[PDB]
């Protein structure tokens, strides 16, 4: 069984496109891969954060992932800072990185140092679990290139204990787009909020956002990305939130107009966010969330600990006991 | 009671000038200060080290310090990498350091990154114990300046939990110099090894090095640094290894020549290294060394742990439990 590792910025709420595109897939793939879901609070603080806001968003993300259907006895879900291994391994991998290397990543009162020196810590976050696959996008290429390099350097200079990862996503999800700009993916940080639907939107507001999506005035409900990207996008959302093949949706809306369909979808989105958000509050506001992240921290420690100890011995840190 | 923190590179053996100048003092001051002696193996690896050589030199330094008379129930003597707090706190203090800051320190196949990013980790090594005083020399000024700055930044941006240190050495020792160049201090890395006496020299060899010291052909045994620095230096060694006031040595050698005196000192050095080195082997080669460094690690953890946890809470890492 391969091991999957995804780190999760606890900075912003995932959109529903982030649900369709990634989180929903995870809930399958956690039965076919040994998945590590890591809320990277120590990465969070390289960028600016509000001390109080930041400890909150971490529970938010943990609950969001638990609501999505991540199962704590199938994946490991944990907060980075609570696994010391991460910054230990990160330091080792920093001593073999070059300055020029860390500088190049930055290309692809002062400049906070975390913005320069996170790359080795990202590497350590992966390799501690002997991760084979990392589900990330094209702005993360330079990172995985350096993680592969840093594993090669470490296995050559010191003993071979690390595991080069590949960038892979087991079941790719459907490309959701901006509701009021279908040629651009759905970002949680859109200046135009009618462009996205947060998993933590007021359901009614998401409903009105579906209705607000830029589409032609009327049309058939037929998937055509190249020429009718407006309605095509909404059909992707519809299919994604319901598991209805796109040709089945097309079938069910044969001879219906945009209005009938948009109204149905707008009730599906509203329906779904209520099922999600009632799960989400029941986790975010629950004593069992501390129990779960405790279990998920101990899991991730037990694994990463042995990776750090193999690394220390390989470089001559510490003692022999 | 103030708290003293000294980090100890495990890279080279201390000279006897390092004993007179620093280590001997520590054996007093550990009754008047809460002393943390930290063998910085994680600093060791920013520079190049042999994986096998490096884990050895760490026991060497631990034994050297224990032989010197550091007492494990009065100071805390520990290996850095075995206290996770160090790289945890180091990471926090890195996110608030600037790039320009770390770059400036460097002034006072590629450039290993540890050489740029150790400063915050040096800071963390100090502040985790709320250290008031750090016994270091003038090439360490820029470091303590930055540690004071990084504590000020942390106590302003987040809660006030850190303790700015001062550079202080409680009982200064006597300035030993190079045996064959008395105008230059005694370095362990001299290309000319007749210049220094290692605490791990063959005692006879150290004897012959005393005899070899550049002095006038004959003279009175009178302390005169400015004009007879040769014999003056040896008198400093003599006084330092024996606790005989310099005016008492002068007294005891009244009407004796360099030859009588050099011979006496050469037997004192030889005598002393045998008392030391028999202590040193009995530690370096002893099962109790693991017990001692274990006790010294647990001590240092219990203290540093609470400092990291106060820091995490102050920045919003982790959870509230």
Residue numbers in the entry:
A (entry chain A), B (entry chain A): 1 to 108, 117 to 329
Task: Please quote the authors directly.
These structures share a similar three-chain asymmetric unit with the SaTrpRS/CXM complex. The CXM complexes show high conformational similarity to Trp complexes and apo proteins (ESI†).
TrpRS catalyzes the ligation of Trp to its cognate tRNA, forming tryptophanyl-tRNA (Trp-tRNA), which is required for the accurate translation of genetic codes into proteins.
